[PDB]
Design a protein around this ligand. Sequence first.
Ligand SMILES: Nc1ncnc2c1ncn2[C@@H]1O[C@H](COP(=O)(O)OP(=O)(O)O)[C@@H](O)[C@H]1O
Ligand code: BEF
Ligand SMILES: [Mg+2]
Lengths: 41, 51, 520
Amino acid sequence: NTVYVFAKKDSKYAYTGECRSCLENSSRPTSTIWVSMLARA
Amino acid sequence: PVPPLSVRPAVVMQGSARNQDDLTHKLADIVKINNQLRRNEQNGAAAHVIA
Amino acid sequence: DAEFDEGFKVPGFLFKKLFKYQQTGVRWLWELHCQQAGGILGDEMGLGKTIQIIAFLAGLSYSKIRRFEGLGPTVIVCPTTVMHQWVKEFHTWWPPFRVAILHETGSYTHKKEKLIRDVAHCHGILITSYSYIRLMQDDISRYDWHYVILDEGHKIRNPNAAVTLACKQFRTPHRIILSGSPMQNNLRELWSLFDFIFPGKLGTLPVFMEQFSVPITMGGYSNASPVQVKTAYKCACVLRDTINPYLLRRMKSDVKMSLSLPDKNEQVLFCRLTDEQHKVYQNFVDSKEVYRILNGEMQIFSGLIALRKICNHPDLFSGEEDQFGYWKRSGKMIVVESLLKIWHKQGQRVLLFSQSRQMLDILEVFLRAQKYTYLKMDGTTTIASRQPLITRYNEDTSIFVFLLTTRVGGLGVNLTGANRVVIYDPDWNPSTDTQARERAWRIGQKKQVTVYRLLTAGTIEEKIYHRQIFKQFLTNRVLKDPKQRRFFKSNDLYELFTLTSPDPLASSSLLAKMRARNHL
DNA sequence: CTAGTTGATCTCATATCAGGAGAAGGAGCAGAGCGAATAC
RNA sequence: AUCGAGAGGA
DNA sequence: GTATTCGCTCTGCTCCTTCTCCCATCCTCTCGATATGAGATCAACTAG
Ligand SMILES: Nc1ncnc2c1ncn2[C@@H]1O[C@H](COP(=O)(O)OP(=O)(O)O)[C@@H](O)[C@H]1O
Ligand code: BEF
Ligand SMILES: [Mg+2]
């Protein structure tokens, strides 16, 4: 449930943020959402 | 080519249960599906079932 | 002479001997020949099917009908015990035919392959066994045979047996099966037979299963819902209409009045386990092996066969006058002793069947223990002597009891000299017992016959009787009528290990029939 | 010669994310080069 | 006995 | 009759994609999981 922004040197994204969201009561496993940045109109 | 028994030894176990080797089990699988496929191709079988 | 539709003539002297239903069967066989399709002479045991085939072939060769002029080289596959029977019937009924046996007994005394070649190039009749057809399938199918009659063709019931695959290699369309019981355990057998005679009518085996076997069978169970019963009825009617032209099945009820057979009885005695027999049975059903069987750990066969042996006679634990197989230790043997005494004092001849060769040996020992003059025929007796033996029992009445195994003693032999018949041990297959009991009530039986089918009450034998009653009901659902009453006596589950001893149509008739079938 | 007994063997039948690196293929574009094809 | 796993040693 | 193009082909050039391979040596221990008979055929007798 925390947004983490990393940058992979060898990838098609300059920057990719992710959150492994998970409802507090363990109804389900954590579902991950990624919001990326396409590499370098 | 089925290999001989020395390539796939049936090792005996603390009792009498003879455990077969992975190759023997796999040859069992190949044989069963080969026989089953043979009876289908010999008989009338759907082309997609034969496939 | 009798003149049929196009060019088929059967000689008058030969035709006159045949009964009305037999010449109807000859008519039907030649209609099949015109259609170039196979068929099943489903007439029950003893109604005469060797004679119908012989007459039809005699008329086919006699008629010179148009590769083959008249009759070509035909092959007749029959059980080993009835090969010489077929030879005798052919010689007496149509002596012009050359009729050679392809068997170790045989008459050739050279390479067999030479015999097949000679019969193929001479347009003779080659009688062979099912084992030989399996073994010599390389040679038997290279010669373009004209007719491939299979006597007792229900041996082809298993679609995957080597004998079935061998018999289904013959290229000719003229495939005939003689079997008074062409359904014995389920509808897979019917599919196998109809694949042999006419490969297309019932489709591929998966399709036949899905369309007929599951609906028809599943609607016969006791817990069947009414809708499912009606679906089974619809499928059974469809199958009956589908198989009608190629199955000719006459009963000994529609022919009995027109054949002057004597009376028949089909009693079923429920015998009682003795104290020692009951003790052994109770100890076995309480043993750990049956417990493991019920848990699925071991195969059921060991327990099933052990219980069948115990009911037959306690030969598991072989307990003077205490030798192996002493009659007083088995209830069914006590009943058999009483019946044999009564029948011997009545001056009658008895036909004593058994499923087990070992039980047949025990019965043989018990018969020598008495003064009864017996005569035995099981799978161990040489085939060459079997037809002689039968003739012996049919000829002199000094021989009292005829011991038999139902697999060899049944299946097409004629034992009309026998008067009483006793089936000592039930089988899982009803048809084995049916053919065994029809060994006596046949054309030529001049005396009233009765069948005594021994079962031990509350044992595995009664459960087997129930299983085969269910099988017989399933068969009657598609052979005689589709209104068959559901089997309600039992659910037929895996609790047979328990001891429970007692004490042009104008589119309106066609549309109407479519509506009728769909409303079901 | 010649049938009957003895073993082996086969069939059949009985239910119920925090790798990486390199080589091989296919893709799309780019142009070169030559045949035909209008056309001055 | 085989397989896998784990913990360790240099 | 030669310009001039011009359509069409022939590579060929980067590149992206796939895919397949590899990832120290040796040694010790513990621990968990992992049918049965009948009939037919044939061949050896086993004697007549
Ligand atoms: N038309 C007939 N006339 C005289 N005897 C007959 C006739 N039809 C059949 N039989 C006799 O009835 C017996 C049973 O016939 P068969 O065909 O051998 O048995 P199945 O029909 O049950 O196979 C045979 O011994 C045969 O001689
Ligand atoms: F059907 Be059998 F030949 F009596
Ligand atoms: Mg018959």
